[PDB]
């Protein structure tokens, strides 16, 4: 009696139950027909619950039972290369996934004294995000821009280029057409990335409950490696759609409206999730694993994506998210339509970690590029109304134009650390000053080629060591000279 209850009201996916006296917060409930539900609100004489499934099969007077265990998901290293629903049920028809342990979905981050400063770098293959906006293990970054501007392309390039580096990956899709999810899975399987990736999917036809809950399950599945000394990288495909689903399921609860009809607690919903991507110290790992592994530090990187209307970053939800993450990458549709790809805005995009999370040579080379780009952009916008410009303004404008042309790339074309090092060193020293603008991109390509065939031993040394000494500088300068001296672009 105390564990068995009935249904009283069914309306738009929210079920109000009765009885169920020893019912606790967050605890799952099993409906008849193998359909599960989560308690949300307790009251003096009833229990509120959201159904995680297809509620059209449930009607008044049916029974329900309280399992007694908190909502949890299967987790292990066996989930690599599979596709599952929010609760972890496979859908790709490759057969059941063995899972050794089940982890909870509602958890709090480790405290202040249980953390460490991020110093180990993460590579994506994009020149701009590496030099301009560096990232590092344990640091959260946000990809924000207008619709159909290249956001999912950048997030897949990182997952692809993380091969060879002992980093697991989780990819969560919320509010996507089934065609896009299937296409993404095909593209992942083609390049072998699915060998170390997991995919959680919740489409646009799925209810609001699954679309709201999925990123928590993704984070819990990604926490397994961080809590044991290994690394992980998780990518939420659209947080804005999760916010919209939360708004719908809250307005269905009559909760007071607000800016853009968003409830009051729309900052907690994103902070409690985005603040689980942390680097833990060796003490935390040793205590958690009971000394099984020592001297190893966990980590977990996050790359959530959010979408803006008409290209404004002054809205409510975008600014709510920006203040939580350690940076942001702003993709501008105006440049995307103009041919600058990937279209990145230097003025708004920043990173809070800074120079700690990258290689020594990149740190010494990529210094103050972003501010120079932003100042160049402002000055160029000013020069339309100006009739006369002095020499310094002309030089700044030319340098900004060359740098803007340099930072262009195509899809599926990763660049090694040595490649970026050589390109940035060539850019800074002004060897591109006499080069015609229209050829710059092509020129860039030729350079890398001339540094793969000859000067090849250095290339390997830079790729592995990542070290800068008067020998590296001299060798790179001598190489650059030879290329321009005897070669064609």
């Amino acid at each position: 009696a105390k564990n068995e209850g009935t249904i009283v009201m069914v309306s738009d996916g929210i079920v109000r139950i009765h009885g169920l006296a020893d019912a606790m917060y967050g605890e799952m409930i099993e409906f008849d027909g193998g359909l599960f539900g989560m308690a949300l609100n307790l009251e003096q004489d009833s229990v509120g619950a959201v159904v995680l499934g297809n509620y059209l099969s449930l009607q008044e007077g049916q029974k329900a039972r309280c399992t007694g265990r908190v909502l949890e998901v299967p987790v292990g290293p066996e989930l690599l290369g599979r596709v599952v629903d929010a609760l972890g049920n496979p859908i790709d028809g490759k057969g059941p996934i063995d899972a050794k342990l089940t982890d909870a979905v509602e958890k709090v981050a480790p405290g202040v004294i249980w953390r460490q400063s991020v110093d180990q770098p993460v590579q994506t293959g994009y020149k701009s995000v590496d030099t301009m906006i560096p990232v590092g293990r344990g640091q959260r970054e946000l990809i924000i821009g207008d619709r159909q501007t290249g956001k999912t392309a950048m997030a897949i390039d990182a997952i692809i280029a993380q091969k060879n580096s002992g980093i697991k990956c989780v990819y969560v899709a919320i509010g996507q057409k089934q065609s896009t999810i299937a296409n993404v899975v095909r593209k992942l399987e083609e390049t072998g990335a699915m060998a170390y990736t997991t995919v959680v999917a919740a489409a646009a036809a799925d209810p609001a409950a699954m679309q709201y809950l999925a990123p928590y399950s993704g984070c819990t599945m990604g926490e397994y490696f961080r809590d044991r000394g290994e690394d992980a990288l998780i990518i939420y495909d659209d947080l804005s759609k999760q916010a919209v689903a939360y708004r719908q399921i809250s307005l269905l609860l009559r909760r007071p409206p607000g800016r853009e009809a968003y409830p009051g607690d729309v900052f907690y919903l994103h902070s409690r999730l985005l603040e689980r991507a942390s680097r833990v110290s060796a003490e935390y790992v040793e205590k958690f694993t009971n000394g099984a592994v020592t001297g190893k530090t966990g980590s977990l990187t996050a790359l959530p994506i959010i979408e803006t209307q008409a290209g404004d970053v002054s809205a409510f939800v975008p600014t709510n998210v920006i203040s939580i993450t350690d940076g942001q990458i702003f993709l501008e549709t105006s440049l995307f339509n103009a041919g600058i790809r990937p279209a990145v805005n230097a003025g708004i995009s920043v990173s809070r970690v800074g120079g700690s999370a990258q290689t020594k040579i990149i740190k010494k080379l990529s210094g103050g590029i972003r501010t120079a780009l932003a100042q160049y952009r402002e000055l160029a916008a000013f020069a339309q109304f100006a009739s006369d410009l002095d020499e310094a303004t002309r030089k700044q404008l030319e340098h900004g134009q060359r740098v803007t042309e340099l930072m262009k790339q195509k899809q599926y074309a990763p660049y090694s650390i040595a490649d970026q090092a050589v390109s940035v060193y060539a850019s800074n020293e002004g060897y591109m000053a006499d080069v015609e603008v229209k050829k710059i991109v092509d020129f860039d390509a030729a350079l890398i080629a001339y540094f793969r065939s000859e000067y090849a031993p250095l290339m390997k040394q830079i790729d592995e060591t990542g070290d800068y000494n008067k020998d590296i500088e001299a060798a790179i300068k001598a190489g650059i000279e030879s290329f321009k001296a005897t070669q064609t672009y």
Binding site: E60, G175, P257
Partner: protein, 463 residues
């Protein structure tokens, strides 16, 4: 079983039942002694189900009786429906007798799973010569048609309805959400005039109808298109089907009107609490299964010329291509009037079509953009001032616009034009040749009203 009516307030009706059985959501109900059916939209407890009626409610009263079908709104589908006009409940309204198909299927069903999706993205060939080169459609994709009346909107619909059946052996379904009665009659007679009516099906819900009727009409056309696609001929190849919707904007508007009547905390600029959910449940069943495929042509209307409004923002996340019709081209006498600079397609990337097709499309768009920028200066200043190179751009643009117009298979009554269905390869070949510069001596008049580059060579050789 034996229910009662408890509360009539406008369309919203509360119906009480026995304690043990309370019809599930969407189960249709019949009212004894009257023509009216009720569709459950929320359960309130105590057996009370709050529902919406279909049709007007004058003459009803508290205390009647209602029986339960224990099933959603089943519509009759099959091969018989082609050429007829039916109601939202699939009742004939053209006074032509009952339909000859006994196959009833529900309109409330789950979308296909992840493992049921196709293994490829394929193109749909219609041979319009402007809708294939600059704005390619994709089987399963979705197209938004921008334009109002006066630019021959119905002519393109006739052409596509004929072409789908002539080339890919497929049938089409037409559903009208909140259309004007007079223009609906005009459309029906116009299609009967061109002898294209026997390849299509029609379902109509007009402005005078209660918003419940207007909201659940599109699902009827959806179910009929589903059955047209599913059935398998020998070899089980399936079929490629089309689905037309008059304006999805009125679909969303009927949705938000129905939400208020039931009562709800508004959201955003008055729109319903659940706005995308409805758009998804409509537009996630237009997909390409391994058996067949459904394409959708939907006309859209942007309120207040503001694309940031929640309804255009939500509907724009599903559109794979956009076609825009400009009155300027119609005034210039070029048909069909489809703008070659403001139409978008997500399928125009080198990955899908290939290399040379992408290069061709981008080159023609570049030349047209340059001509658009050049015509202003050639107007304010004189034509001679301009450079010889830009003049060449002007002439090539003129030839391109002329070549972009072709005769149709449904205008042979009006002018005796036989009608053309150009395969894509001929279009690409002709455009590549034109861009190369081999068609520099042919006069411009040789390009108008011609289906293929040979016709042009023949027409140009004739005179």
């Amino acid at each position: 079983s034996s229910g009662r009516i408890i509360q009539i307030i406008g369309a919203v009706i509360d119906v009480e039942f026995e304690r043990t059985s309370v019809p599930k959501i969407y189960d249709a109900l019949q009212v004894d002694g009257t023509e009216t059916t009720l569709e459950v939209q929320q359960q309130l407890g105590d057996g009370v189900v709050r529902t919406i009626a279909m049709g007007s409610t004058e003459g009803l009263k508290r205390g009647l009786t209602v029986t339960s079908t224990n099933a959603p709104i089943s519509v009759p589908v099959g091969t018989a429906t082609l050429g007829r006009i039916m109601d939202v409940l699939g009742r004939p309204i053209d006074e032509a007798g009952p339909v000859a198909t006994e196959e009833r299927l529900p309109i409330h069903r789950q979308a296909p799973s992840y493992a049921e999706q196709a293994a490829s993205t394929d193109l749909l060939e219609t041979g319009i010569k402007v809708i294939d080169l600059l704005c390619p459609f994709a089987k399963g994709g979705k197209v938004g048609l921008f334009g109002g009346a006066g630019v021959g909107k119905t002519v393109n619909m006739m052409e596509l309805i004929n072409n789908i059946a002539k080339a890919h052996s497929g049938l089409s379904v037409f559903a009208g959400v909140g259309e004007r009665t007079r223009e609906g009659n005009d459309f029906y007679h116009e299609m009967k005039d061109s002898n294209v009516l026997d390849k299509v099906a029609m379902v109509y819900g007009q402005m005078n109808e209660p918003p419940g009727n207007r909201l659940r009409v599109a699902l009827t056309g959806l179910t009929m298109a589903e059955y047209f696609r599913d059935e398998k001929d020998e070899n089980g190849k399936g079929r490629d089907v089309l689905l037309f919707v008059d304006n999805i904007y009125r679909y969303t508007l009927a949705g938000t009107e129905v939400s208020a009547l039931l009562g709800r905390m508004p959201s955003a600029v008055g729109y319903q609490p659940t706005l995308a959910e409805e758009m998804g449940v409509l537009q996630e069943r237009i997909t390409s299964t391994k058996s067949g495929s459904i394409t959708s042509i939907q006309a859209v209307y942007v309120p207040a010329d503001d694309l940031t409004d929640p309804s255009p923002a939500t509907t724009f996340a599903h559109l794979d291509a956009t076609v825009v019709l400009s009155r300027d081209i119609a005034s210039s006498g070029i048909y069909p009037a489809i703008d070659p600079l403001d139409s978008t397609s997500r399928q125009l990337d080198p990955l899908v079509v290939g290399q040379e097709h992408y290069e061709i499309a981008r080159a023609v768009q570049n030349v047209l953009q340059r001509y658009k920028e050049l015509k202003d200066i050639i107007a304010i200043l004189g034509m001679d001032e301009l450079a010889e190179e830009d003049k060449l751009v002007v002439y090539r643009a003129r030839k391109i616009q002329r070549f972009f117009s072709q005769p149709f298979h449904v205008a042979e009554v009006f002018t005796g034009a036989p009608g053309k269905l150009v395969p894509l390869k001929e279009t690409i070949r002709g455009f590549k040749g034109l861009l190369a510069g081999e068609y520099d001596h042919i006069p411009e008049q040789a390009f108008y009203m011609v289906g293929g580059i040979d016709e042009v060579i023949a027409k140009a050789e004739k005179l």
